[PDB]
């Protein structure tokens, strides 16, 4: 659909999960945008049936859950392959909305690959040493 | 060094390697943008000393070479993990300029990990089957 719209749904979903609701102020503060800009996006999200304070439609909820899943999987992926922890978040934030579901699912299989045998993680770590 | 600037340097570097030179028209066609947009960017890259008959400076060449390496490595990464070939290019294009060097290097180690022992690739493929 749209990276910005997705980023908003992701943030709105997280806020609802964290607080039980999503205030415009909290959205604007989390995205570091002006509250007026949030107002415009919300009205658009409303028109597109992602939501109706504000409440997500089942359509918006399904997307939010997917976006959180993708963010979490990507952090786990970068963490597993050894990226410095402090750099993981910004990298995930910048690539998460530009990956196809095919890539996401293959990354999921990759994470599973390393999780079923610690020897694989060690072998990968050895390569980093080289 | 914005993502847009990097994408232009990447394209300019590729055109020079492919044809021996980079015409505004070819850059405009490759990026699917208006020539005025290209001109504005080129003037900016000139001001920032990446280029000067578009000719890259050593600064621009170093970056261009890195960007091509990164693009190729990212395609190999998605390829190795099983992403459908047809979807690889668009994914790489959208994430390549949003990954830290730390992530790129660890992805490089990951690619090396699979390339050095095909048994690892087979094991990864078995998981995709589950
Ligand atoms: Mn996001
Ligand atoms: Mn995220
Ligand atoms: Mn690019
Ligand atoms: Mn590229």
Swiss-Prot record, chains A, B:
Q: Where in the cell is it found?
A: Cytoplasm
**Boundaries of every HTH dtxR-type domain copy:** 1-57
Instruction: Please list the GO biological process terms of this entry.
Output: intracellular manganese ion homeostasis
Which sites bind Cd(2+) 2?
A: 10, 71, 93, 96
Instruction: Summarize where Mn(2+) 2 binds, as residue positions.
Output: 10, 71, 93, 96
User: Sorted alphabetically, which InterPro entries does this protein's record hold?
Assistant: DtxR_MntR_Metal-Reg, Fe_dep_repressor, Fe_dep_repressor_sf, HTH_DTXR, HTH_tscrpt_reg_MntR, Iron_dep_repressor, WH-like_DNA-bd_sf, WH_DNA-bd_sf
Knockout consequences: Null mutant is very sensitive to manganese. Mutant also displays increased sensitivity to cadmium.
Record entry for activity regulation: DNA binding is strongly activated by Mn(2+) and Cd(2+), but it is poorly activated by non-cognate metal cations, including Co(2+), Fe(2+), Ni(2+), Ca(2+) and Zn(2+). In the strict absence of divalent transition metal ions, MntR has a low affinity for DNA.
Q: Which GO terms describe its cellular component?
A: cytoplasm
Keywords, sorted A to Z? Activator, Cadmium, Cytoplasm, DNA-binding, Manganese, Metal-binding, Repressor, Transcription, Transcription regulation
Function recorded in the entry: Central regulator of manganese homeostasis that regulates the expression of both manganese uptake and efflux systems. In the presence of high levels of manganese, it mediates repression of the manganese uptake systems MntH and MntABCD and activation of the efflux systems MneP and MneS. Binds with high affinity to the regulatory regions of its target genes. The manganese concentration required for activation of efflux is higher than that for repression of uptake.
Assembly notes = Homodimer.
Entry comment, domain topic: Contains an N-terminal DNA-binding domain and a C-terminal dimerization domain. Contains two metal binding sites per subunit, site A (corresponding to metal ion 2) and site C (corresponding to metal ion 1), which both contribute to the metal selectivity of MntR. A large metal cation is needed at the A site to correctly orient and position the C site ligands. Smaller, non-cognate metal cations bind at the A site, but disrupt the C site, blocking the full activation of MntR. Binding at the C site also favors Mn(2+) and Cd(2+) over other metals.
Name this polypeptide is given? HTH-type transcriptional regulator MntR
Species of the source: Bacillus subtilis (strain 168)
**Gene for this protein?**
mntR
């Amino acid at each position: 659909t749209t990276p910005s719209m997705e980023d908003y749904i992701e943030q709105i979903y997280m806020l609802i999960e964290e607080k039980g609701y999503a205030r415009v102020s909290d959205i604007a503060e989390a995205l570091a945008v002006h509250p007026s800009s949030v107002t415009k996006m919300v009205q658009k999200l409303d028109k597109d049936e992602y939501l109706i304070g504000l409440v997500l439609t089942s359509k918006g909820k399904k997307i939010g859950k997917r976006l959180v899943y993708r963010h979490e999987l990507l952090e786990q992926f970068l963490r597993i392959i050894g990226v410095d922890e402090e750099k993981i978040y910004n990298d995930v934030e910048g690539i998460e909305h530009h990956l196809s579901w095919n890539s996401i699912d293959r990354i999921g299989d990759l994470v599973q690959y390393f999780e079923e045998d610690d020897a694989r993680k060690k072998d990968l770590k050895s390569i980093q040493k080289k």
